[PDB]
RNA sequence: AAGUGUAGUAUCUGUUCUUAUCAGUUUAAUAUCUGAU
RNA sequence: AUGAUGUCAUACUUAUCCUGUCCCUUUU
């Protein structure tokens, strides 16, 4: 359930690759008009700049936002990043989605809905 | 069955449900295992059809199309009044066929 | 056997036999376990239980000799409690 | 509340270079290779070179005060954990006739030693490939050492 | 950076009955410290043996290097040790002493 | 294959006696177990 | 990665509890010391001696090699960079097929060529597992038979000890695992009590077979676990599964849960009820309650309707779980309640009433996935409630559902889809309010190009769309879904087509408007024009759409015809296959709409394209021709039968599957319906060609061949067909060999059996055992097919059956018993008592026999005789055998008596003779002697 | 209670669940009791048979019904 | 000079008990098997 | 002069059987 989200994303990508999905229907028509990618499941001890530098390998990040708690210390695992171009978001969802770093691997998805602070899930 | 003696019939109590047989096993007698002279209709068990178990084939076990019936040789021999003839077991047949 | 006589767990308390059975299990099973205690407690839940199934369960959990000891300790105490007009054995009044 | 930093943390660097049970810094560059030079270390701490060292076979080089972390210990009480480690790499050097080529040589770089290092009355600094040649008298510690090799 | 199939134990078969065990220890030490070396003292065990080094990396390196290495007249087959599958003969008794020692040493 | 069974050996002997030795296909057309090469091989090896 | 824990499985109540306690007290101090500041951890002499088995001795040869390897730690760093006959042993015994190198470690004991040494003898005899796993099919069957017979001899201990590691082979392929599972099942079928100590050892290997992707493999694992549980006692299985509750490995917890579910399915719900109740009341750890909730959920999902009576009791197990502090326990309890609900038909709403109030209360304080679980539970519980409370429940839940409509969580999406499918199906759902509120988001938020890609998501969306269309209306869903008909995505297009097909089939397309009809026609055209993956979605959709449109599809008829022609001229296998499929599907609509010129043009194009070499296209063309002959009349079909029959004659040798099936169907329909355009010589040639069609690897092909032979017999005549059938030399005894006998029976049922009887009797005079057995089987099948018609042929069939009753061969006796059974079933009430007695005179000695086929035939014949000859004569013939002394004779007679007593339970009173009254027993029924 | 007699089922054998199916080790008393019980049930079933059996005695139909239901327990004798 | 697999049956080829007794299991009874002279 | 034994071949019967799937494992 919690870790099966990355499995579902990888399975969707594999099915699009195996079902002969074209470029126009390659799991991007729904995430269009917005490059706000939501990363979740990250560890509680992750820093903002470290994650920015890690996700910056696929391009320049425009506006990142980590889940800042009221008094916990900004340790929730959720994060929303509107990158420079939507092509960078697609590249991150294709390569960085499900990447393993700092022990527990995290998941990535394309929201393209709004700037919701409380929208992810533990 | 004559083709599968290692099969276990359900033998459950009869219900008010009408069953169907798979298209591959269309017309085959449920008990007599013949191909002609049907007399009575086949009644399914109460637990033998509940959701995912609904609409399955009696003998074939697959998705049913046509409604099955008991063979007249099984009806005259007082054999059609038995319990639920659902093939609960699946062994010694179609086991390694998927490997091929 | 002593578990061959018909008994009735409805005509006796349960709190009086809880810690005795717990101590017997801790002595026979050695360690501290909650599954065995809860299983023994739920075994005597019916109004007309059977000692044969209880002995089988005790043999499955215990070694078989300790199972016989537990059966021969629980059967007569429960029988004496069911025989008591107030519904308890002679040990419940001692302390 | 949350204490936002937006700066570089250590978790990514720890996951990037982590030893068996410790952190591993001073990561050599990807331009290195295994050399084949006819040169071997002859460490004689008291004018007596019992062992022999030919580092052309090994790429990982760790001589320090970590019995579980490093590859093996050393009887050098004046040596730190990770202070100075020379590494052979294919550096593009200009030959005698000008023919440039990726020749294997040892890179001279200080690993942030606590008390520095010295070789033949001269300390080696980082960010500069010093004139690393043969027949050098060096030391394998931070404070000092009364042993050399060749 | 290696498969889970690689293990510290390695089964070496196709050897003589009177195999020179000192040379065997020397050959096994080319990888790392021989934590244990069991020589089959049985008839069916006569000619087979097991080794266990204190490191998996050295054992894998020797498995890659010593794959069917030459011998005096044969070439013993070296394979990765399979699972145990037989431990009822052994038991985990007397481990409470080690647990108490660990709890007393560190104090936690 | 070529197990060289007993009944196959008797059949090969009868074929070599009646059909002939220079007719391997005539014997292989009544064996249905091995080729004429294998049949002549068994004839020259054991059924000679 | 999750399955990798299976690789970490080692083999082999108080001592286990202490071991688990030591495991916990070893798994605690590791992170304890980690915070205070592996598989290659230090090893001990005890650990070393325990790891490997016997047959080894530690021996450091010199006193220098130990202190040579002790400094090897430092010798890996300083001195490492520095200055620096024809023997072999495979495993052949007499054949012993090739053992893989991974299997070399397992079958190493057989590598030793020693012979003639008891225990080692049995261990070597247990090397047949190598031939079973690795070897040919005959060797596999032989090893299976030997293991079945040598069960008690080889002993269950060594068998399990040799089978468990093979199951744990990291290189164990799927076929090897299937063979090992079959062998374990065969071993458990014989050994009953000896499987108790190896219960845990077998379960540790069998549980992962349940948690697997392969559906057939999971079914095999569930069956094996159920058999293992039914073998031993529920108490022993419970004791074995006890410590797995608090196991650290969550995979071990899931395995134990599946095992407990299987044990409950086998031994029954209440047998495992109190164990589960004690597991649920465990305040030891939250993992215990989680394992209990998971076990309850799995037991419900496996049992289905079996939780009806114990459901209230299950509520007693689940009531204290809803108040769990840890969110995991609460989620597991919600999932369990949802499983018990959705698996249960409407009943026992009161049993869930205790869980009604808090869950909705949790909806008030719902946040995160807990809200999703609560929504799923409320959706499962809504139909179980009555309309009065259901109105308020749905009115409250719909707002939360609409609020959660924009959830990115895919689990939340599935929960919302299930809640919509459950709630929208309620009678208290507002149609206009539904279309106003839930319809536009369901089209926008729910319907997306990414959701359809998933497997479960596709079926969930299909069910939700079907329910919404049935609830609110068909026109709105049609208008919402028709726009996606031109979707570039093939999967989304298939989903939209399936939704439209289900809507048209359930609600009916009469509500489809003219503009909506044109849009649907354009969508179907675009879909048929773009079909990459070969699937019946487009074909079934076009068929249902045409059947629903009816006469309204006449304007779309010519466009479809032009598209079909262009696709027939297009790529054959890609385009013309779907073209012919659409033609065969829409033949009914084309004939209903009076497409006379269209039907003729289609027939001409079919006659033109019938010469295609592609079997996929040729078979579809033949099927379309069959459909045209079914719609267009024989004399009205433009491609007349005179060209169709001889042109389809040589097509029987196409050797393709679909081509052969379509050709057989077309020839059979033409010969059953028309039976006139086929000439006598033409019919004879068609029969000579169909005689070769019986060698196929299908059963439907054989049935169609028998039907076509019967039609040809009814058309031409009995003599030639019976002569062509009598020449069956039966090269093979299988591959539809008896099929000739079935065809003889079909011809006898279609033609005069007075002609078919004596020809068969004369053909039975042949010497060949194959021909004799074939004549017997054909006579049996003919009598069975005739039934009442056999009232005259009884006296004529008596002597041949009596002569064949002489057991010269087992097959002859089997055919005799089968013919007797068919005759007794057919001669019921016709007055054939004399022939029945004459046949029983020779059938009675067949009771003593060991052949399974012969025994089954004898039992069936005894049943038929009791049906027709009557139970009085049956008991009179089986009377003396009841109290016989022998074991085998008494067993056979008791089987016969049980068969005679299963039925005729009322008529056994009179047949019971008068046995004299003993001293302490009065068995004589004196009331029967009451003379009125 | 050291008995060790857990007669439930072993491997899903034949296991005749019908009442009076018959077996191999059926003693004469068992067959006689089954036959007497079946005959009593049949006499209770057939209406004309009940009339012919009760027409002998002056007892009524209910008298025969009670006498038949009473003879079901231990008709032959304690084995 | 072509058949695939799933269960079961028979006829073919090669080998073995002149062991005198006792007791038991088992057998309809033999037989076989298990211990002693 | 019937038989028991069982590697290894052979004929036969069950109108035996070839698109069967992960539509349900989503446990950390």
Curated annotation (Swiss-Prot), chain A:
Keywords: Isopeptide bond, mRNA processing, mRNA splicing, Nucleus, Phosphoprotein, RNA-binding, Spliceosome, Ubl conjugation. Involved in pre-mRNA splicing as component of the activated spliceosome. As a component of the minor spliceosome, involved in the splicing of U12-type introns in pre-mRNAs. Part of the activated spliceosome B/catalytic step 1 spliceosome, one of the forms of the spliceosome which has a well-formed active site but still cannot catalyze the branching reaction and is composed of at least 52 proteins, the U2, U5 and U6 snRNAs and the pre-mRNA. Component of the minor spliceosome, which splices U12-type introns. It comes from Homo sapiens. It is found in: Nucleus. One of its GO terms (cellular component) is nucleus. Belongs to the IST3 family. There is a cross-link at residue 7 (Glycyl lysine isopeptide (Lys-Gly) (interchain with G-Cter in SUMO2)). GO terms for molecular function: RNA binding. GO terms for biological process: mRNA splicing, via spliceosome; U2-type prespliceosome assembly. This is RNA-binding motif protein, X-linked 2. The chain holds residues 2 to 123 of 322 of the full protein. Residues 35-113 form the RRM domain.
From Swiss-Prot, chain D:
This is Smad nuclear-interacting protein 1. Degraded by the proteasome upon binding to the SMAD1/OAZ1/PSMB4 complex. It is found in: Nucleus. There is a cross-link at residue 3 (Glycyl lysine isopeptide (Lys-Gly) (interchain with G-Cter in SUMO2)). Residues 61-124 form the FHA domain. Required for pre-mRNA splicing as component of the spliceosome. As a component of the minor spliceosome, involved in the splicing of U12-type introns in pre-mRNAs. Down-regulates NF-kappa-B signaling by competing with RELA for CREBBP/EP300 binding. Involved in the microRNA (miRNA) biogenesis. May be involved in cyclin-D1/CCND1 mRNA stability through the SNARP complex which associates with both the 3'end of the CCND1 gene and its mRNA. It comes from the Eukaryota. It is linked to Neurodevelopmental disorder with hypotonia, craniofacial abnormalities, and seizures: An autosomal recessive disease characterized by severe psychomotor retardation, intractable seizures, dysmorphic features, and a lumpy skull surface. Patients are hypotonic and have poor feeding in the neonatal period. Component of activated spliceosome complexes. Component of the minor spliceosome, which splices U12-type introns. Binds SMAD4 and CREBBP/EP300. Binds the SMAD1/OAZ1/PSMB4 complex. Interacts with DROSHA and SMARCA4. Component of the SNARP complex which consists at least of SNIP1, SNW1, THRAP3, BCLAF1 and PNN. Ubiquitous, with highest expression in heart and skeletal muscle.
UniProtKB/Swiss-Prot annotation, chain E:
Residues 5-18 are annotated as: Interaction with pre-mRNA branch site. Component of the 17S U2 SnRNP complex of the spliceosome, a large ribonucleoprotein complex that removes introns from transcribed pre-mRNAs. The 17S U2 SnRNP complex (1) directly participates in early spliceosome assembly and (2) mediates recognition of the intron branch site during pre-mRNA splicing by promoting the selection of the pre-mRNA branch-site adenosine, the nucleophile for the first step of splicing. It is found in: Nucleus. GO terms for cellular component: nucleoplasm; nucleus; spliceosomal complex; U12-type spliceosomal complex; U2 snRNP; U2-type spliceosomal complex. Its main location: nucleus. One of its GO terms (molecular function) is mRNA binding. One of its GO terms (biological process) is U2-type prespliceosome assembly. Pfam families: RRM_1. There is a cross-link at residue 18 (Glycyl lysine isopeptide (Lys-Gly) (interchain with G-Cter in SUMO2)). This is Splicing factor 3B subunit 6. Component of the 17S U2 SnRNP complex, a ribonucleoprotein complex that contains small nuclear RNA (snRNA) U2 and a number of specific proteins. Part of the SF3B subcomplex of the 17S U2 SnRNP complex. SF3B associates with the splicing subcomplex SF3A and a 12S RNA unit to form the U2 small nuclear ribonucleoproteins complex (U2 snRNP). Within the SF3B complex interacts directly with SF3B1. Component of the minor spliceosome, which splices U12-type introns. Signal peptide: none annotated. Belongs to the SF3B6 family. Residues 8-83 form the RRM domain. It comes from the Eukaryota. Keywords: Acetylation, Isopeptide bond, mRNA processing, mRNA splicing, Nucleus, RNA-binding, Spliceosome, Ubl conjugation. The modification N6-acetyllysine is found at residues 18, 30.
Swiss-Prot record, chain F:
It is found in: Nucleus; Nucleus speckle; Cytoplasm. Ubiquitously expressed in both fetal and adult tissues. It comes from the Eukaryota. Phosphorylated on serine and threonine residues. Has no effect on subcellular location nor on homodimerization. Phosphorylated in vitro by CDK2. Phosphorylation enhances interaction with PPP1R8. Residues 1-48 form the HTH myb-type domain. Residues 24-47 bind DNA. It is linked to A chromosomal aberration involving CDC5L is found in multicystic renal dysplasia. Translocation t(6;19)(p21;q13.1) with USF2. Belongs to the CEF1 family. DNA-binding protein involved in cell cycle control. May act as a transcription activator. Plays a role in pre-mRNA splicing as core component of precatalytic, catalytic and postcatalytic spliceosomal complexes. Component of the PRP19-CDC5L complex that forms an integral part of the spliceosome and is required for activating pre-mRNA splicing. The PRP19-CDC5L complex may also play a role in the response to DNA damage (DDR). As a component of the minor spliceosome, involved in the splicing of U12-type introns in pre-mRNAs. This is Cell division cycle 5-like protein. It comes from Homo sapiens (Human). The lineage of its organism: Eukaryota, Metazoa, Chordata, Craniata, Vertebrata. The gene is CDC5L. The chain holds residues 8 to 55 of 802 of the full protein.
């Amino acid at each position: 359930n919690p870790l099966t989200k990355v499995k579902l994303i990888n399975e969707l990508n594999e099915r699009e690759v195996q079902l002969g999905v074209a470029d126009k229907v390659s799991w991007h028509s729904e995430y269009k008009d917005s490059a706000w990618i939501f990363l979740g499941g990250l560890p509680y001890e992750l820093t903002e700049g470290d994650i920015i530098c890690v996700f910056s390998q696929y391009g320049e990040i425009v506006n990142i936002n980590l889940v800042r708690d009221k008094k916990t210390g900004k340790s929730k695992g959720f994060c929303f990043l509107c990158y420079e171009d939507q092509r960078s978001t697609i590249l991150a969802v294709d390569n960085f989605n499900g990447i393993k770093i700092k022990g527990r691997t995290i998941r990535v998805d394309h929201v393209s809905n709004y700037r919701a602070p409380k929208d992810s899930e533990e | 069955a004559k083709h599968h003696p290692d099969l276990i019939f359900c033998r459950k109590q009869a219900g008010v449900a009408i069953g169907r047989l798979c298209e591959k096993c269309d017309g085959k007698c449920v008990i007599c295992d013949s191909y002609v002279r049907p007399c009575t209709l086949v009644r399914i068990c109460d637990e033998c059809n509940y959701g995912s178990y609904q609409g399955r084939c009696v003998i074939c076990g697959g998705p049913g199309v046509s409604d099955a019936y008991y063979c007249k040789e099984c009806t005259i021999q007082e054999k059609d009044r038995d319990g639920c003839p659902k093939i609960v077991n699946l062994g010694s047949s179609k086991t390694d066929l998927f490997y091929e | 056997e002593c578990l061959e006589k018909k008994v009735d767990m409805s005509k006796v308390n349960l709190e009086v036999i809880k810690p005795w059975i717990t101590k017997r299990v801790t002595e026979i099973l050695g360690f501290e376990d909650d599954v065995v205690i809860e299983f023994i407690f739920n075994q005597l839940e019916v109004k007309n239980p059977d000692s044969k199934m209880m002995q089988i369960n005790l043999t499955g959990f215990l070694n078989g000799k300790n199972a016989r000891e537990f059966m021969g300790e629980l059967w007569p105490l429960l029988l004496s409690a069911q025989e008591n007009i107030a519904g308890i054995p002679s040990a419940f009044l001692e302390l | 509340k949350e204490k936002p930093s937006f700066e570089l943390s250590g978790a990514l660097l720890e996951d990037t270079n982590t030893f068996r049970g410790v952190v591993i810094k001073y990561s050599e560059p990807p331009e290195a290779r295994i050399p084949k030079k006819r040169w071997r270390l002859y460490p004689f701490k008291n004018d007596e070179v019992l062992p022999v060292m030919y580092i052309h076979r090994q790429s990982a080089y760790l001589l320090g005060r970590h019995r579980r972390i490093a590859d093996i210990p050393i009887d050098h009480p004046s040596c730190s954990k990770q202070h100075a480690v020379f590494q052979y790499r294919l550096v593009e050097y200009t030959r005698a006739d000008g023919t440039v080529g990726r020749r294997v040589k040892p890179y001279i770089i200080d690993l942030g030693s606590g008390n520095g290092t010295f070789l033949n009355n001269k300390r080696i600094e980082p960010q500069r490939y010093y004139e690393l040649k043969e027949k050098d008298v060096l030391k394998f510690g931070f404070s000092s050492r009364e042993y050399v090799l060749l | 950076r290696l498969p889970p199939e690689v293990n510290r134990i390695l089964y070496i078969r196709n050897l003589p009955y009177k195999i020179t065990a000192e040379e065997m220890y020397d050959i096994f030490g080319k990888y790392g410290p021989i934590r244990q070396i069991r020589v089959g003292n049985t008839p069916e065990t006569r000619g087979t043996a097991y080794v266990v080094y204190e490191d998996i990396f050295d054992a894998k390196n020797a498995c890659d290097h010593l794959s069917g290495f030459n011998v005096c007249n044969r070439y013993l087959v070296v394979l990765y040790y399979n699972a145990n599958r037989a431990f009822q003969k052994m038991d985990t008794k007397k481990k409470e002493e080690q647990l108490k020692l660990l709890k007393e040493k560190y104090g936690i | 294959g070529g197990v060289w069974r007993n009944t196959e050996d008797e059949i090969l002997k009868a074929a070599v006696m009646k059909y002939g030795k220079n007719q391997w296909s005539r014997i292989a057309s009544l064996l249905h177990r091995k080729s004429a090469k294998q049949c002549k091989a068994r004839w020259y090896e054991w059924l000679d | 990665e999750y399955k990798k824990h299976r690789r970490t499985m080692i083999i082999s109540a108080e001592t286990p509890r202490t071991d688990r306690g030591g495991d916990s007290i070893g798994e605690t101090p590791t992170p304890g010391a980690s915070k205070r500041k592996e598989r290659n951890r230090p090893l001990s002499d005890e650990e070393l001696d325990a790891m490997f088995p016997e047959g080894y001795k530690v021996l450091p040869p010199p006193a220098g090699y130990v202190p040579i390897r002790t400094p090897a730690r430092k010798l890996t760093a300083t001195p490492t960079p520095l200055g620096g006959m024809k023997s072999v042993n495979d495993q052949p015994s007499g054949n012993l097929p090739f053992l893989k190198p991974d299997d070399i470690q397992y079958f190493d004991k057989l590598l030793v060529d020693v012979d003639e040494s008891e225990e080692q003898k049995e261990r070597k005899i247990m090397k047949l597992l190598l031939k079973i796993k690795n070897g040919t099919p005959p060797m596999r069957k032989a090893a299976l038979r030997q293991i079945t017979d040598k069960a008690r001899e080889f002993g269950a201990g060594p068998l399990f000890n040799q089978i468990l590691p093979l199951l744990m082979s990291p290189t164990l392929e799927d076929q090897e695992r299937h063979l090992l599972v079959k062998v374990i099942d065969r071993i458990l079928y014989k050994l009953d009590d000896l499987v108790r100590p190896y219960v845990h050892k077998i379960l540790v290997v069998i549980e992962p077979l349940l948690i697997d992707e392969d559906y057939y493999a999971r079914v095999e694992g569930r069956e094996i676990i159920s058999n293992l549980a039914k073998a031993a006692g529920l108490a022993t299985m419970i004791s074995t599964m006890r410590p797995d509750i608090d196991n650290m490995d969550e995979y071990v917890r899931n395995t134990t849960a599946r095992a407990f579910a299987v044990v409950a399915s086998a031994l029954g719900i209440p047998s495992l009820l109190p164990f589960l109740k004690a597991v649920c009341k465990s305040k030891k750890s939250w993992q215990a309650r989680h394992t209990g909730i998971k076990i309850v959920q799995q037991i419900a999902i496996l049992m289905g309707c079996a939780i009806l009576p114990h459901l209230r009791s299950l509520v007693e197990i689940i009531e204290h779980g809803l108040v769990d502090e840890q969110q995991k326990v609460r989620t597991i309890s919600a999932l369990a309640i949802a499983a018990l609900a959705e698996a249960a038909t409407p009943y026992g709403i009161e049993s869930f009433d205790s869980v009604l109030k808090p869950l909705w209360k949790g909806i008030r304080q719902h946040r995160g996935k807990g809200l999703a679980a609560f929504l799923k539970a409320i959706g499962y519980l809504i139909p179980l409630m009555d309309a009065e409370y259901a109105n308020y429940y749905t009115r409250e839940v719909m707002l939360i559902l609409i609020r959660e409509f924009q959830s990115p969580d895919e689990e939340m999406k599935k929960i919302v889809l299930k809640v919509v499918k459950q709630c929208c199906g309620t009678d208290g759902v507002e149609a206009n309010y539904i279309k106003t509120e839930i319809l536009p988001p369901f089209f926008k938020h729910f319907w997306q190009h990414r959701m359809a890609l998933d497997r479960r998501n596709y079926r969930q969306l299909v069910d939700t769309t079907v329910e919404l269309a049935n609830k609110v209306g068909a026109a709105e869903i049609i208008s919402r879904i028709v726009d996606d008909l031109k979707d570039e995505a093939e999967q989304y297009r298939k989903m939209v087509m399936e939704t439209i097909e289900k809507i048209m089939g359930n609600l009916g397309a009469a509500d489809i408007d003219h503009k909506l009809e044109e849009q649907l026609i354009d969508g179907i055209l675009y879909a048929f024009q773009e079909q990459t993956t070969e699937d019946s979605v487009m074909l079934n959709g076009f068929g249902t759409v045409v059947n629903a449109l009816g006469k309204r599809v006449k304007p779309y008829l010519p466009q479809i015809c032009g598209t079909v022609l262009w696709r027939l001229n297009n790529k054959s296998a890609k385009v013309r296959q779907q073209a012919a499929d659409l033609i065969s599907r829409t033949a009914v609509v084309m004939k209903t709409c009076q497409e006379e010129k269209l039907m003729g043009h289609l027939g001409v194009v079919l006659y033109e394209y019938l010469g295609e070499e592609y079997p996929e296209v040729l078979g579809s063309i033949l099927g379309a021709l069959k459909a045209i002959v079914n719609v267009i009349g024989m004399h009205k079909m433009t491609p007349p039968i005179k060209d169709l029959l001889p042109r389809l004659t040589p097509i029987l040798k196409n050797r393709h599957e679909k081509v052969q099936e379509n050709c057989i169907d077309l020839v059979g329909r033409i010969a059953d319906r028309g039976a006139e355009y086929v000439s006598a010589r033409e019919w004879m040639r068609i029969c000579f060609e169909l005689l070769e069609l019986l060698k196929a690897h299908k059963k439907a092909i054989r049935r169609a061949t028998v039907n076509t032979f019967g039609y040809i017999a009814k058309a031409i005549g009995p003599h030639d067909v019976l002569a062509t059938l009598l020449n069956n030399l039966k090269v093979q005894e299988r591959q539809n060999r008896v099929c000739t006998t079935v065809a003889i029976a079909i011809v006898a049922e279609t033609c005069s059996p007075f002609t078919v009887l004596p020809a068969l009797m004369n053909e039975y005079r042949v010497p060949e055992l194959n021909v004799q057995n074939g004549v017997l089987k054909s006579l049996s099948f003919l009598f069975e097919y005739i039934g009442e018609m056999g009232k005259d042929y009884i006296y004529a069939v008596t002597p041949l059956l009596e002569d064949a009753l002489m057991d010269r061969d087992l097959v002859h006796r089997q055919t005799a018993s089968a013919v007797v059974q068919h005759m007794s079933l057919g001669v019921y009430g016709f007055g054939c008592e004399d022939s029945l007695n004459h046949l029983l005179n020779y059938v009675w000695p067949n009771v003593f026999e060991t052949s399974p086929h012969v025994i089954q035939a004898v039992m069936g014949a005894l049943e038929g005789l009791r049906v027709a000859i009557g139970p009085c004569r049956m008991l009179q013939y089986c009377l003396q055998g009841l109290f016989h002394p022998a074991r085998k004779v008494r067993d056979v007679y008791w089987k016969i008596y049980n068969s005679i007593y299963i039925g005729s339970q009322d008529a056994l009173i009179a047949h019971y003779p008068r046995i004299y009254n003993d001293d302490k027993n009065t068995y004589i029924r004196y009331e029967l002697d009451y003379i009125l | 209670m050291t008995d060790r007699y857990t007669i439930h089922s072993q491997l899903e054998h034949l296991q005749s669940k019908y009442i009076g199916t018959g077996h191999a080790d059926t003693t004469k008393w068992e067959w006689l009791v089954n036959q007497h019980r079946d005959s009593y049930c049949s006499y209770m079933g057939h209406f004309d048979l009940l009339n012919y059996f009760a027409i002998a005695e002056n007892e009524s139909k209910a008298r025969v019904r009670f006498n038949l239901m009473e003879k079901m327990l231990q008709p032959c004798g304690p084995p």
